[PDB]
Design a protein around this ligand. Structure first.
Ligand SMILES: O=C(O)c1ccc(NC(=O)c2cccc(CC3CCCCC3)n2)c(Nc2ccccc2)c1
Length: 190
């Protein structure tokens, strides 16, 4: 059970190729402490985990999540330890290969929102749908950090204050990971 943390691009996932929202268009609807699915590249069949919180902080919208899919963790761990392809774009001989592989191959966190037309009015249903781990499409700076404890993960971001991290982590620790439903990811290898 891994944690992920980082700053999100907020996107609408539209006939358009892409719409990147300014964070101030959605901050009225934060924080979100109920679990949203975490998927790969906005694919609904690639659920790998669950969000733990979405928070407005000074330097953007920060996401903390849990990567919990057994099939995904088993596959990513095996590739990290045995695949020269997965290791090719990472530094030689990392101490924590799984964490480095995810940091390199899935560096972008994106938060799916409804369209701004509804955000300015009064939305009827949920404003956010999922967070995705992304290999393309990154607009803002910083990248995702993966690690085995949420404190370490969030403390890697210098732009998150001591008090911001404490607010973020206040909720993260209150979440019990094993009682999260199993995400739907299946290994491509079958
Ligand atoms: O079914 C197929 O034909 C197929 C082909 C390509 C795939 N993935 C890619 O092309 C691809 C590109 C960037 C990032 C990733 C995810 C990342 C997960 C952990 C280890 C390294 C890769 N996948 C995937 N998806 C996938 C691959 C590995 C792990 C998880 C999903 C499926």
């Amino acid at each position: 059970g891994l944690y992920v943390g980082g700053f999100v691009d907020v996107v609408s996932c539209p006939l358009e190729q892409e719409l990147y929202l300014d964070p101030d268009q959605v901050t009225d609807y934060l924080p979100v402490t109920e679990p949203l699915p975490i998927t790969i590249e906005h694919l609904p069949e690639t659920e790998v985990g669950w969000t733990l919180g979405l928070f407005q902080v000074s330097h953007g919208i920060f996401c903390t999540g849990a990567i919990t899919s057994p099939a995904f963790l088993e596959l990513a761990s095996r590739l990290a330890d045995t695949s020269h392809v997965a290791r090719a774009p990472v530094k030689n001989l990392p101490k924590e290969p799984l964490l480095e592989i995810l940091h390199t191959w899935l560096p972008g966190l994106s938060l799916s929102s409804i369209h701004p037309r509804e955000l300015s009015q009064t939305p009827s249903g949920p404003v956010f749908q999922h967070v995705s781990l992304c290999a393309l499409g990154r607009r803002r700076g910083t990248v995702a950090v993966y690690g085995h404890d949420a404190e370490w993960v969030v403390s890697r971001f210098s732009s998150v204050s001591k008090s911001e991290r404490a607010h973020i982590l206040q909720h993260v620790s209150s979440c019990r990971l094993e009682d999260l439903s199993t995400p739907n990811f299946v290994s491509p290898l079958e």
